[PDB]
Amino acid sequence: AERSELTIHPKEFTTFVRNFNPFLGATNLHTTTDFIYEPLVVFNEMHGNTPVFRLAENFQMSDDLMSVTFDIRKGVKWSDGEAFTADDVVYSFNLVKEKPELDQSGINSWVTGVEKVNDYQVKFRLSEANSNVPYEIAKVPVVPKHVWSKVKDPSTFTNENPVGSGPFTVIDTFTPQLYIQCENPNYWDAANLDVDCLRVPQIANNDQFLGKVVNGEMDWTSSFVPDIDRTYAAASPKHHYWYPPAGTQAFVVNFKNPDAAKNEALTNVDFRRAFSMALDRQTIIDIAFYGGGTVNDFASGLGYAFEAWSDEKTHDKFKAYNSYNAEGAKKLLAKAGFKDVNKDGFVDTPSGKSFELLIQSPNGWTDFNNTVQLAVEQLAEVGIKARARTPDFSVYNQAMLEGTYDVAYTNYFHGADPYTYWNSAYNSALQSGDGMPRFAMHFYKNEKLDGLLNSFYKTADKQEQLEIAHGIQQIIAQDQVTIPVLSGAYMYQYNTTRFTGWWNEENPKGRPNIWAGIPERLLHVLDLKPVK
């Protein structure tokens, strides 16, 4: 026919609401970052953070590592025809500093100010030395000053008719069950783009998705698929996948729970170690993930992808509390004083109050929902009372930000080194702020761990970063802050019916996933060519 439509699935929803504000990650559509608002630079995390220069053509840190200058590409246009300039970068950083609810990554902890040098150069000043700061700066969306500076309230603006810098800005069709986002008519990198539109169908959960993917309806996806070789891969020789190793998954407990009895259990080190010993991590991997994961027996969560970074003395000291041992969990509850005093057959708190733990995972994430149900059975076998909850993602996330939940099962982002995990999962600076994600929302606050995390990139010296890692690894392991379970996979399925050029095990160019927060998806769509 006359245009290519590439069918993708970045996020499950029951109905689409029209919201393309790139600062509102808890309520927007997940083709806004990258595809509407292109970054300054994309770093290829699977390949050493090798840079790909996009809206900026270069950057340079100062000698003292307290500032950085970015060079803006000349001849780039916004989708309405206006020039992209340093003014747009200065405006967007000043907006996130002034309305801190729009900071989704912690940038206001690192950047104190932003100066225009001229129309094509911007200078950033820092609170503290950070050789990794260009990677942090590239997370922040840059929007057009000429539109956003006239909006009454950017933190409530739904941006229904977006003006963007990236490959797909035109809202061709919008309905609550399907939308189609087509090529920016002034795209600066039009010569490299061979896809006309993204086609985004509404899919609520993994059972609805399995029906569509088995029937060949999808092109680019990253959902959990049960029994994948016998269901999806067996339906057609056009159906393919590639699952490179991803990050940690853990049970996270709330140290500020407002119920006195639950707070007494969750904040007790012995209780978190007994919870951890009750679990059988390899059975969770075999049943809930059909084998698609690796045990994580690091109290610190570090994981076997980063075994070369481990202090093995620390790993070996706490490994027994992160291995299956049901008898040991019963003995530890008894020594610590979690005794059944009300005769209901479950342990009560040291003060003698009865409690039950409510363990949440998101609606429709069936691999995580099954993991929690297996853990609730394992926990009952040592006398710990728990039950599963499966809230909608927006309610799951809000309950973490507000400190209203008991325990949550979650994964984390995965980087080129351990900092992406440790900093997002533990820095107390990421516990306050209405735009922050859920990952640090346990409310365990330790200023000495924060000092070590903040020191990791004060130089670029990797031998010193390995010693700083050993300190971080020891503090988290000795306090058993969360209960790590396994290291997961970057789930990804591609179809060769309508497009070619896909990344895969023989073409392993970068993280291949379609989710928001994987900025390499802009690089991967620039490699795709229609066959129909």
Ligand SMILES: CC(=O)N[C@@H]1[C@@H](O)[C@H](O[C@@H]2O[C@H](CO)[C@@H](O)[C@H](O)[C@H]2NC(C)=O)[C@@H](CO)O[C@H]1O
């Ligand atoms: C670190 C992180 O938050 N990753 C999120 C992805 O896990 C999530 O994808 C969903 O993962 C569930 C757990 O493995 C799968 O059951 C589910 O099929 C999958 N959903 C899709 C649409 O791929 C994505 C999307 O919710 O958000 C990432 O941020």
Ligand code: NI
């Ligand atoms: Ni450890």
